[model samples]
Target chain A: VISRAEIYWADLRRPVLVIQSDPYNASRLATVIAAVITSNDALAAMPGNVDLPATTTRLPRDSVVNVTAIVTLNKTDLTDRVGEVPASLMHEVDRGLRRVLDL
Target chain B: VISRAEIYWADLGPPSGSQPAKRRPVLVIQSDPYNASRLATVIAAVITSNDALAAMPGNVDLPATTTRLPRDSVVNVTAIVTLNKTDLTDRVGEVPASLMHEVDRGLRRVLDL
Candidate 1:
C-alpha cells in the first residue's frame, strides 16, 4: 500500500521516507527500502539535510528526513501516513541516494 | 585546510526552499583529491543531531568523544553536497581516522559501493 516518496511511521516507531515504489521488489517481498526521519533542528540545520514542510506531514513537529539513514524493513513496519514529500524534494532525495552511494 | 571527519561551518544556501539553505556544520568526506587539489569544492556528508531515532543502516554515528559534539550525531551520507573550500569556516572539530573509516563503511552499505 505504501508508495514511493511517501512518508510513514515505521518499525522504529519513527517517521520514515519510502524509497521503493510499490511496483518494486516491495510488492513481491515483505520489506521495503526507506530512510529514517528526525526532527532535530540541529540535524536539519546540517548542509544537504532534507526538510519537509511542517504543515503537511503527520509529524507533530517539523521533520528532517535523513536521506542517508537508509534501511530495509518489512512493510508491516509502516503504520501511519505522514503524507508525501513534494516531487521537487524527492528529486533531492534521489540525488542524495546517488551521491551517498556513488551510484 | 579542511580534512575528513573535521566539522566546519558551510554556506548551504538558497535562503528559502524545501530545506534550509543556511550555514551549518558539514563533515568532510573527500580526502583523496585533497591530497592533490588545494581546497577544491569537494563532496561532504551532512551531519545532524536528531539521533533520537536509533541509528539505522547507512547511518554513521559520531560519538561525542570522536566528534566533540554535544551529543551523538548521524552523518547523512544521502545528503551529500559539494562545498567550496572557501565555504568552510571556523574548524569546530575533526572525526578520528578510525571512525572516519566506519563512516566510509556506512556509505558503502547505503550506496552498495
Candidate 2:
C-alpha cells in the first residue's frame, strides 16, 4: 500500500494509508463486500464484544448507515460532482449492491 | 497484490485492510499539567492501537495517513501550564480555547475508548 507522511496532534504522531475502489467493476464490488465481511468478523472478536464504532469501523451486519448507492441516477439525480452513471457500469453496480443488500 | 484507482475521504476511501485506523492522528491533551512523558505515553499508545489494528489478518491495512511528526519538535508540553510553570507547556505554546477543546475531545475519545 502506498503511504504518506505522519501527522501529529498535541504530541501524537501517526501514519495513514489511502485506498481507492471502483464501483464500476463486479470484481471490485465483490472485494468491497468481502472486505466488509472480513472487517466485521475481526471486530466481533474484540475482547469486550464492543460493536465497531461508525466513523472508523464498519458497522455490524444489517447496519443501516446513512450511506447508499443507487442503481442509476436520473437526470435530476445527477449531482454536480457525478455526471450520468455509465449505463453498462450502473447495471453492474446495481446488481451487485442489490445482491449484497438482498434488496 | 492487485490494486487500482485510489479513493479518499476526510482524506481516504474504501477498505484495503483488515483493521484500519479509521481516523487520523490528532494529538490533543486533556486534563491539566500535560508533561512530555505523559504526551509521549499517549503517542505510544496511539501507535500501539494502530499497530494492533494493522496486525489483524484479512484486514486491509490502511496506509499511514501522514508521516509528519506530530510533537517531537516541541520540547515541553503542559495542558494548562501557568506562566510561572514555563517548563511545563514548553514548546507547545499557549493553546487557545478552541484548540484545547479539540485536544480534550480527541484525548477523551482515544484514551477512554
Candidate 3:
C-alpha cells in the first residue's frame, strides 16, 4: 500500500497537508486549520509543553510528516444556512497559518 | 492502519515581499489528546499525487537533502491536510518501510514524543 507519507516521499520536494473530515459535513475543516495555526506557537509555548514556536523561513524535504486537528462541531442555528464552515470563521485561521509559515 | 500527509511549513496567503509580514501558517492536524502540536511542528517532505513541483511551492530546502526542519520560533510551518485518503496513503505504503518510518519518526521527534 502507498501510504500518504510515501506519496510525499515519492517526490521528496513538495509539501502538503492531507485533510479528512465528515464528507457529509466537512466545512469545519477550514475553521479547525485556522484555529490550529492561530493558537499554535503561543499555545505550544504554554507550560503544558505546547511549544507553538513559529518555523523559520525554510522547510526540510527528505522525509514526510503528518498532523491532524479535531474540533467541536458547530451546531448553531447559523450554520444551517451558512453551510459547512463559514468562510468568516476560517478566514482568520487561513491568515494565521500563512503568516506563521511565512508563505 | 491510519495515514495522513504532513508538511513542516506552508502559508495560506500570497508571498511575503519584505519584513516577512504575518500571513499565518495553515495547519490541519489530528492526534490523541495532549499532543495537538505534534504533527503541526514537523517539517516533513512529501510527494503529492501530481504536479509535485507546483505543490508546496512555499516549502524550503528543496533539491537538497539537508532541508531544515520547521521550528516554531524562527519559522512557523503551516500545513493544510486531509485524512483517510487511502490513495494518498497507498502512495506512502509504496515507500520503503524505513522511509515511511522516517516520516513518522520525524513527526514524533517534532512532537517530542
The candidate that achieves the highest lDDT relative to the unseen native structure: 1
Tens digits of lDDT, candidate 3, A1-103: 1111011111112332211222212332121111221223334433222122124212331211222231111122112120122234233333333233222
Off by over 4 Å in 3: A1-83, B1-40, B47-113
Worst 10 residues of 1 chain A by lDDT: A21-30
For B1-113, candidate 3 gives per-residue lDDT tens digits of 22222322232223322111123322222222322333333222332323232322222222112222233211111123232222222221222333434444433322212
**TM-score to true structure, per model:** 0.48, 0.17, 0.22
lDDT of 3 at B55: 24
User: Alpha carbon lDDT of residue B79, candidate 3?
Assistant: 29
In terms of DockQ, which candidate is strongest? Answer: 1
DockQ of each: 0.04, 0.02, 0.04
Model 2 TM-score relative to the real fold: 0.17
Per-residue CA lDDT of model 1 for B9-56, tens digit only, reads 677765422232467677877654341354346566667776343334
Where in model 2 is the C-alpha error above 4 Å? A1-103, B1-30, B33-92
**What's model 3's interface RMSD, roughly to a tenth of an angstrom?**
14.7
Candidate 3 DockQ vs. native:
0.04
Candidate 1: residue A30 lDDT (0-100): 52
